[PDB]
């Protein structure tokens, strides 16, 4: 899993040398920048539901078909799915904040994505909304440096999913 | 790999849920201590070398026969081997002292060794007993540096020892 | 092969595979037709998760078949 | 092309100049618009010291523009020499291999994977030897830790194009040069996605590789003698690709890392993409 | 490799001397900023994919023919590569903006892409009008985020435009 | 050259990935740090002469037969010599802090080290000592972090040479 | 180009050997079928245009939202477009069918169509549609043998889409 | 590798003799039906994606807790090679069925995979469970095509069954 | 092992060919070359003391800051270890004649040299005056090629530490 920690140690650990001052200073950066980043996560982590909810709800109306008997949208289940999904990603970018890397993010989220959505007909598009109105909605909730780490990591899925 | 954070994190995604706010507090002090973490880390890559040498000088003044004719030490080549070695636990050692996670040290380092040493007719007693000589001479100087603001060590102190004791075990 | 240490620096879980030997996987650079070696007619390798599906599937097109596959640690 | 004399009459080192050629450098005495011949599209004249700054200009000032200057002395030099490589040698690790053995691959290794390129003592690996020599490490995978290696990276793969980082791993995991513009293609798009660890692993996992030194053989040049499968004009590509004995491949010199074989070169073997 | 730092480093080695106070300062100022610089490299990597999308597409409205049976985009193989070193190109260039030196953009990026281009067919002119197209979105975001405090970063958008034309450049 | 800024460029490189919030948060741990590192730098560059004639001078109280006639200590030559060495070693100290990396230090310094020693038989002892006294001398001009960083690549060097 | 011919000799050539019997009587499956193949290259060809408008047409019932503005479907260049797609797919499978191999298929079409498709946001649905109201259509102008190929090639882009 | 026609001969060649007038009619009656095996393989490659797709959607609606967390088919990177192997087992199987001969399915395929499975803790039933929901939906094409001369194809599918089973078996 | 006999049968072994007329040749010439070689073994072993006694006192000559306290040759501990160590040098040249060839002393010896010599801080110059000095009494009891061999082995140890 790919965190600051974890790379240089990798980093050091290939050419076959101890943690020379160069890696700590990069440890010292990931330790500095956790304060805001734990913030984040805290305040994602209590609005969950909410942001789901308003998520979920917002890919309809901006994909109202999908509603309609036949389609995906339709029948509780796959309501049910949905909701469940969104959760995840969720709980996933907290865990990125905490862990201070993108590891938790590319290993659950990414790492497979194209095939599972490819073979299930999962349309990238969706999660997207899902992404950017939630984006939106932390967008009141934080502010300054906190508010931007939650971005970056947000974003960095839109950018896996498209 | 593993390290204090990625662990919790895992643990919490196999019950299916966001982290704890308890859990959470976890992380949130084990960052406050980070700087006396760092300095620790650096008081042993500093002085690398020297507990090396130390723990070895004092590993052969103890078991002479290892570097008598016939012993496991004797000649050069292996002498050199025996002093890499060495080092290498070390490295690793350090590296989980940073992580704040055996993991690392457990998956690259101690896994086989044992029976590699075995295999080749290596004294695993000696080898795990060098690892304690270093222990202590490492402990020696994280414990009584310069220039550090004063203040208690004691908790990566032990920490520092669990993971030496890790090795010494694994490989004995 | 008994595996000293984690054989790859890249980290995934790793697991010994040993397999017995065709003459192709490992021909020696000899006059003649090629002969594997009689000391290891079944090497055993320690393989990251990543690399053992090209690893099987190259070691199944040559003769040589999976005798056993074992988790590294 | 040949150059005949190192130096002028009067002594002067000669210099090769090679230009576009553009329709008021040379043209055909010819009624219509003038134009040079085609054939002649890169011209090249030896000049002696004392004219060359004069020549320069002159082409420059006009539209031709300099593809590049060459001493005469090195231009008319011999093609290199083959003798080393056209019997490589070869090197096998049998197990139960004797301290001396042991060492002997890996200088073979170091040599081959990094070319004559110098390795030295702190950047040589203690661990990935340690493994070989204890067993646990075929000699094919030391050779993957070193490509896996930051040195490797470093020299060929951080400084130079993907475009040449491909043909220099080539020759360096396979004694071959590349063959046709496929390769490369192939070769840079699973960089893209895979990323750096799976390029390397798939010269070391493809079957030639297996065929030829498969396991526990120090790579080899099998290039500079003929190969099934392999495009005649590889051959030629290949004396690009290795020039003599104490050249090495460095990104240290001027304008270290480019490309050997010309992107046009591999076109001619074969087209389709 | 090589960034701003590395490189005055250098040429103070070579005239032998201890660093300026003036040389200093510039590194002193650099410094400073940082968090603006990070910023900027932030904003490209997080709208990368639409950067590249936007250009291609506006490439395609212009250029019809590449799109064109016999064109160089055409068919999906094709395109697929130009769409593949579009991203390449704008990787290399995130990645000098951080450095604060085109270095690492030249060596790895640049050297020797014109005569690919030549050799396979593709038509230079057209991937600097690319490289251009990307580069105007690009700045686009750069300086125009949300959340961020409001200042001038007038500075960094012109370094950046300038790498975006050593390319350009340097593939036409 | 090795500095922070440099890797974390590379090891993006390699993957063949975008900067993503990982390297950045490193890179931000280097630019923080600078600042001590920066005035550390100054401290030195201005002791620079007073710092080196005391090293010299007790690595001859330290091994006084070099002064001997016959010795390498002995005669003018080779005291221009050993001063310049020293300043060298120096000299790239401050590079190294100011580069935020040991890089400066591994490229000129440490990369054949060993071989340049033995071939003109130049004893690591000496030099080792000359950095003990400077280290100490330096342990009086700097404080807090500002010594915290030099004294790690003075030491760093320490670990080389021997 | 993968056809039946360029294989065996693609295999001949790999092993070094001359074209044995094994090799020709390959060569001779392909031959014989060729009969049937031509007979459906002929009857594509002909009603192309008919199937095109089709294809395209059915599409958008499938997918009424697509002709609503602010969508893909709508607006002229669009729908252009997306004749000119399915035109292209049609193409290369006659093409196929003459060659007596995927490989036309291969190369124009199915290399790289993720990427792209991914890229400017084609989703392969649509695609598919377009595809299966071809062959419901072929399944009338076309009989026996000469169907059966048409469909396999038609097919062979639907597994590759999806 | 090995089919039909391949073994007999095999068989044949250690009892040092010329093929049995008997063992002939076998391949005599072998030839006969090809057009008939051919079509099978033809429906399933035509029908590939969808096998899977569909015997996919079904697997999980049975078993949910392979697709929640501490589940096997959790998260994506496992999902996908789920369905991976599902595929590769299904495209043997189609080998297989156009030889003749169960052979290439068991050794590249089928020879090892319940270990694998074991060691890393995916439940062999459920994989097990897959291969049959593949198994119903592939006959259900290869029996009901449309455009192919109406005839009896039952040997086939019968054979086409068996392949399938040992599957199941050797991976269960 | 490296000798003469060893490595011809090594090289005919890797071309996989049997032991020809030109290996031969060269075993033809170690063996001739033996009966030199064997006397000067037997001249080396039946000094050894004596010469160990002259060298260990000459490194103390050359460099008398050594048994001052303090330092390395100070106390008896460390002559005695001293006076192992050329034992040692001694016995494995001998080793060497016999063998006829270098062998024993890469393998006992050189391989690993540096890095012991440096972790120990045991400096190359003294080992070399000590073979120094014993090779100038070898240069008294043998004569000839005896004598020649002899050299030729002593000295590839002063190279190696050098
Ligand atoms: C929400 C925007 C839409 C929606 C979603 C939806 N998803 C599925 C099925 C799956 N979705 C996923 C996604 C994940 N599962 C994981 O484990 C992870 C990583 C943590 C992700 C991102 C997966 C794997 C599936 C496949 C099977 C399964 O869910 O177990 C469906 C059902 C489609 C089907 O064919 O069964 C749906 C509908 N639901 C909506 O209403 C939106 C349109
Ligand atoms: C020193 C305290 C003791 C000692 C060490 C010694 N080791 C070897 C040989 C090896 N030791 C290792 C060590 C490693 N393998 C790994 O995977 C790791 C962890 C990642 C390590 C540290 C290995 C690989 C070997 C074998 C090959 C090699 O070159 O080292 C020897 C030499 C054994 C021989 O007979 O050649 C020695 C001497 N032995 C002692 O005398 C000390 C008690
Ligand atoms: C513990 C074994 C000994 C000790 C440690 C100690 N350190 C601090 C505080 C700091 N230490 C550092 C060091 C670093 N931070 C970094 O980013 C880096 C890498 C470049 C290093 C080396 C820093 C910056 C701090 C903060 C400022 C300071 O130096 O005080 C303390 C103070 C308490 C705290 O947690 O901050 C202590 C106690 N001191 C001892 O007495 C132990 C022997
Ligand atoms: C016309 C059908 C196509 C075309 C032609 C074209 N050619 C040029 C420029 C040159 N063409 C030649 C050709 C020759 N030079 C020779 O001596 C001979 C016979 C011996 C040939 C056939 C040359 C050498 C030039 C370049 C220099 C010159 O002008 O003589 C151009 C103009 C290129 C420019 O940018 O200058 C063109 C347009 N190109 C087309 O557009 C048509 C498809
Ligand atoms: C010393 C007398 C002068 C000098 C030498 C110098 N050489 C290099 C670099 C290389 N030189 C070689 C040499 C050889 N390669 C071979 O294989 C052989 C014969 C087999 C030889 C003699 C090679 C391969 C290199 C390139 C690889 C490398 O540099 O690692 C340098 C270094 C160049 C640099 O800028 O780093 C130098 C300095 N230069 C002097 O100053 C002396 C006049
Ligand atoms: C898109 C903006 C334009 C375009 C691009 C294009 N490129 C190729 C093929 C290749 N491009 C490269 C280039 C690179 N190699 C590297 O290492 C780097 C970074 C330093 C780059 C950017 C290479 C090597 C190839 C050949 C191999 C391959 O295709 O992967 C094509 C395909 C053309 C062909 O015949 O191969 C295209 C289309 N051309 C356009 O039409 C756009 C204007
Ligand atoms: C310039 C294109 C835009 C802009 C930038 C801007 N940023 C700041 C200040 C900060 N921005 C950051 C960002 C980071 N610092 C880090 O360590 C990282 C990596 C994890 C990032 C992404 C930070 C922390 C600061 C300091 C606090 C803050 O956000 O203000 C400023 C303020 C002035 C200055 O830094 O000197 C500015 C101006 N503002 C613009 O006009 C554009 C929108
Ligand atoms: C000082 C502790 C002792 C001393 C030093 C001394 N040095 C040399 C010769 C060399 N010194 C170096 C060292 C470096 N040169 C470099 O390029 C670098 C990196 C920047 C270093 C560290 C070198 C390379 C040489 C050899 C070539 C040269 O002449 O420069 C000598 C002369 C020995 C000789 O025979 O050349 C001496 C004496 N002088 C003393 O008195 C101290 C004991
Ligand atoms: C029809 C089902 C839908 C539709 C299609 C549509 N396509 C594009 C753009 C492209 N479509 C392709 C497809 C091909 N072109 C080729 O050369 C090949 C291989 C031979 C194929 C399969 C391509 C490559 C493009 C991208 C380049 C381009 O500009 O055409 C668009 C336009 C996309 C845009 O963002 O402008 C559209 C709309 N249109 C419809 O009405 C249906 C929904
Ligand atoms: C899906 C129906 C069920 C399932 C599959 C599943 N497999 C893995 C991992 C592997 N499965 C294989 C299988 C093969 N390797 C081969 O060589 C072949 C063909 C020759 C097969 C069939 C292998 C080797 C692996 C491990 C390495 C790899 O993935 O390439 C997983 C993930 C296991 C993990 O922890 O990574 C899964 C999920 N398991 C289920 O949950 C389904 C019931
Ligand atoms: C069996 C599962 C179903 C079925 C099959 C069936 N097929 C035929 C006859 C033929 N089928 C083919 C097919 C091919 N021959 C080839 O060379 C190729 C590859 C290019 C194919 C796809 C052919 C040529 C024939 C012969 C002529 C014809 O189809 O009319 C039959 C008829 C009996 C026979 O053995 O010829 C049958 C029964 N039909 C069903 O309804 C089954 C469910
Ligand atoms: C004699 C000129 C000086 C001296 C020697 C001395 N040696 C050591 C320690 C070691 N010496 C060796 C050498 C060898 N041991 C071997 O097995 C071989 C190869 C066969 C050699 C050449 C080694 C390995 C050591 C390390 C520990 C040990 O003694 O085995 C010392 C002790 C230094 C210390 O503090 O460790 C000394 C003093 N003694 C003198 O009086 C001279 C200066």
Redesign the pocket.
């Given at each position: 899993m790919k965190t600051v920690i974890t790379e240089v140690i990798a980093s050091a650990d290939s050419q076959g040398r101890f943690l020379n001052?160069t890696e700590?200073?990069a440890?010292?950066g990931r330790f500095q920048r956790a304060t805001a980043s734990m913030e984040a996560a805290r305040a994602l982590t209590s609005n969950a539901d909410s942001l789901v909810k308003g998520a979920v709800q917002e890919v309809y109306n901006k994909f109202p078909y999908l509603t309609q008997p036949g389609q995906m949208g339709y029948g509780d289940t796959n309501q049910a799915k949905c909701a469940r999904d969104i959760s995840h990603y969720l709980r996933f970018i907290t865990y990125s904040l905490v862990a201070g890397g993108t590891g938790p993010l590319d290993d659950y989220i990414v790492a497979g994505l194209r095939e599972v959505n490819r073979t299930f007909n999962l349309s990238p598009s969706w999660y997207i909304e899902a992404l950017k109105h939630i984006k939106g909605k932390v967008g009141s909730q934080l502010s300054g440096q906190p508010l931007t780490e939650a971005n970056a990591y947000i974003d960095y899925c839109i950018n896996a999913l498209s | 790999m593993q390290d204090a954070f990625t662990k919790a994190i895992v643990a919490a995604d196999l019950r299916g849920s966001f982290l704890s706010e308890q859990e959470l507090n976890q992380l949130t002090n084990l960052v406050?201590?980070?700087?006396?973490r760092?300095?620790?880390v650096?008081?042993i890559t500093g002085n690398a070398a020297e507990i090396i040498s130390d723990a070895a000088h004092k590993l052969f003044a103890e078991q002479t026969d290892l570097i008598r004719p016939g012993g496991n030490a004797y000649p050069n080549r292996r002498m050199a081997a025996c002093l890499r070695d060495m080092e290498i636990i070390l490295r690793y050692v350090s590296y989980a002292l940073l992580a704040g996670d055996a993991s690392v040290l457990e998956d690259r380092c101690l896994n086989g060794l044992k029976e590699t040493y075995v295999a080749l007719g290596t004294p695993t007693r000696s080898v795990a007993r060098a690892v304690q000589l270093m222990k202590e001479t490492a402990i020696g100087y994280?414990?009584?540096?310069s220039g550090?603001?004063?203040?208690?060590?004691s908790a990566?102190?032990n920490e520092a020892a669990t993971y030496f004791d890790k090795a010494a075990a694994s490989i004995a | 092969s008994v595996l000293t240490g984690d054989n790859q620096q890249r980290g995934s879980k790793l697991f010994k595979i040993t397999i017995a030997l065709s003459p192709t996987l490992a021909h020696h650079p000899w006059p003649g037709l090629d002969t594997h070696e009689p000391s290891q007619s079944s090497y055993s390798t320690i393989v990251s998760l990543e690399r053992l599906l090209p690893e099987m599937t190259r070691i199944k097109r040559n003769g040589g078949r999976i005798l056993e596959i074992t988790e590294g640690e | 092309m040949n150059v005949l004399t190192t130096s002028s009459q009067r002594g002067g080192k000669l210099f090769k100049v090679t230009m576009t050629l553009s329709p008021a450098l040379s043209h055909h005495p010819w009624p219509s618009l003038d134009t040079y011949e085609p054939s002649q599209n890169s011209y090249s004249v030896v000049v002696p010291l004392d004219r060359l700054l004069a020549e320069m200009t002159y082409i420059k000032n006009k539209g031709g523009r300099v593809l590049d200057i060459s001493p005469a002395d090195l231009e008319a030099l011999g093609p290199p020499d083959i003798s080393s490589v056209a019997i490589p040698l070869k090197v096998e690790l049998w197990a139960k291999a004797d301290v001396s053995d042991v060492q002997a691959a890996i200088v073979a290794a170091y040599k081959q994977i990094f070319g004559n390129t110098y390795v030295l003592e702190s950047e040589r690996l203690t661990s990935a030897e340690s493994l070989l020599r204890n067993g646990s490490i075929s000699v094919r995978e030391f050779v993957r830790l070193l490509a896996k290696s930051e040195l490797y990276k470093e020299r060929f793969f951080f400084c130079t194009s993907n475009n040449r980082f491909t043909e220099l791993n080539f020759k360096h995991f396979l004694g071959r040069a590349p063959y046709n513009q496929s390769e490369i293609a192939a070769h840079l798009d699973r960089y893209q996605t895979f990323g750096y660890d799976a390029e390397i692993d798939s010269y070391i996992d493809s079957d030639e590789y297996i065929q030829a030194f498969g396991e526990n053989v120090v790579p080899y040049y099998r290039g500079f003698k003929s190969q099934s499968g392999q495009t005649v004009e590889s051959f030629n590509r290949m004396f690009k690709l290795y020039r003599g004995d104490a050249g090495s491949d460095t990104n240290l010199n001027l304008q270290g890392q480019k490309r050997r074989v010309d992107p046009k070169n591999l076109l001619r073997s074969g087209r389709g993409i």
């Open positions: 001052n700590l200073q440890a010292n | 406050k201590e980070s700087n006396k760092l300095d620790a650096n008081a994280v414990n009584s540096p550090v603001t004063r203040g208690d060590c990566l102190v | - | -």
